[PDB]
Paper text:
Each sdAb recognized nucleoprotein (NP), a critical viral structural protein enveloping the RNA genome as part of the viral ribonucleocapsid and also a vital component of the viral assembly and replication machineries in concert with VP35, polymerase L, and VP30 (25). Here, using mutagenesis and X-ray crystallography, we determine the region of NP recognized by the sdAb and, in so doing, discover a novel tertiary structure of MARV NP. The last 64 residues of NP visible in the crystal structures primarily consist of three alpha helices associating to form an upper V-like shelf of the two C-terminal most helices (arbitrarily named 1 and 2 counting back from Leu695), with the third descending between them to re-appear after a turn as beta sheet positioned under the C-terminus. Electrostatic surface rendering reveals an asymmetric basin-like depression between helices 1 and 2 with helix 3 forming the basin floor with a hydrophobic core of Leu676, Val691, and Met683 at the closed end, while Leu663, Leu695, and Tyr667 reside at the upper more open end.
However, sdAb C was highly refractory to crystallization alone and yielded a single polycrystalline cluster from thousands of screening trials. While further attempts to improve this crystal form were unsuccessful, the structure was determined and revealed the C-terminal His6 tag provided fortuitous packing interactions. The electrostatic surface potentials of the undocked sdAb flipped 180° from binding NP give an epitope’s eye view of each paratope clearly showing the prominence of the hydrophobic CDR residues that engage the basin. Both sdAb A and C appear to exhibit the classical convex paratope, with relatively large contiguous regions of hydrophobicity, while sdAb B appears less pronounced. Here, the main chain undergoes an S curve reversal (i.e., S to ϩ) to move Phe29 toward the basin with an ~11 Å maximal repositioning to displace the neighboring Thr28 which shifts by ~6 Å. The final position of Phe29 is almost a supporting role to Tyr100, but it does have modest contacts of its own. Amino acids Arg30 of CDR 1 and Lys1 of FR1 also move to meet their respective salt bridge partners on the overlooks with both having ~9 Å shifts. While two of the sdAb performed well as crystallization chaperones, the third (sdAb C) required much optimization for success, suggesting the approach is still somewhat empirical.
Author numbering: 2 to 127
Write the structure that this text describes.
């Protein structure tokens, strides 16, 4: 089982993103879902997660800027990110934990988020 991220790419400093993850589709059983990130050479760190019951946890660097939600009608876990900073640049990975068991964790493939105003203005034709 591999999940499928979308919504990454280039974004200006101060800009916003809507990250999405197509999960396993096994809505017949509960799960925890969330988002990690990994910057080159650095350790993976928790960005946001939801327990089986919908309790949210956020990495300390989030500082109220990101919101995690899940859509069971659409089989997704989503991350709404505002006020992106250069330091947020990293590969973002979603995950699903069947029955809340991290031991059975499914991961996405990762999607790059690059926070750069000059690059985003160039690429998005602003
Ligand atoms: Na942008």
């Amino acid at each position: 089982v591999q999940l499928q991220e979308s919504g990454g790419g280039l974004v200006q400093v101060g800009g916003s993103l809507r990250l999405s993850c197509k999960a396993s589709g096994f809505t017949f059983r509960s799960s925890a879902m969330g988002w990690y990130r990994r910057a080159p050479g650095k350790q993976r760190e928790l960005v946001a997660s939801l327990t089986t019951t919908g309790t949210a946890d956020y990495g300390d660097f989030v500082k109220g800027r990101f919101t995690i939600s899940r859509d069971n009608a659409e089989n997704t876990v989503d991350l709404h990110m505002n006020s992106l900073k250069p330091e947020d640049t990293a590969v973002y990975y979603c995950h699903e934990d069947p029955y809340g068991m991290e031991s059975l964790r499914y991961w996405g493939q990762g999607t790059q988020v690059t926070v750069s105003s000059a690059a985003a203005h160039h690429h998005h034709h602003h």
